[PDB]
Subunit: 70 residues, 2 copies
């Protein structure tokens, strides 16, 4: 399937804290993708083809759209 890919870049310190961080990274990215795709209402297929980079920048680009809708 295509699960929530975790971008594991190793930078350890506190095993517990970095895991909590990691979890929260997924938590935030998941809702990020969710509210973005829902606000723009692009397509569900291009949601099922959302590359991590596509998701991140989509959020930033929507930011610009909102930021001009003042």
């Amino acid at each position: 399937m295509k699960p929530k890919t975790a971008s594991e870049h190793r930078k350890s310190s506190k095993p517990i804290m970095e895991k909590r961080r990691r979890a929260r990274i997924n938590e935030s990215l998941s809702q990020l993708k969710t509210l973005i795709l829902d606000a723009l209402k692009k397509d569900s297929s291009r949601h099922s083809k959302l590359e991590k980079a596509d998701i991140l920048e989509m959020t930033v680009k929507h930011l610009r759209n909102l930021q001009r809708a003042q």
Copy 2:
């Protein structure tokens, strides 16, 4: 017992494409934190220490603001 369910990488993609994606991930996330922190002007000092999760969330939360404050 020890249930080994996650040890090997069940991960499939092209090394080159995923590397290109990786670059864009970092690119997107970088400008993402930038425009968010600067738009609300929280603190640029604490901006030197933003947890990845804090960064994603900060952007999502600002999305909400943009969606409902105007």
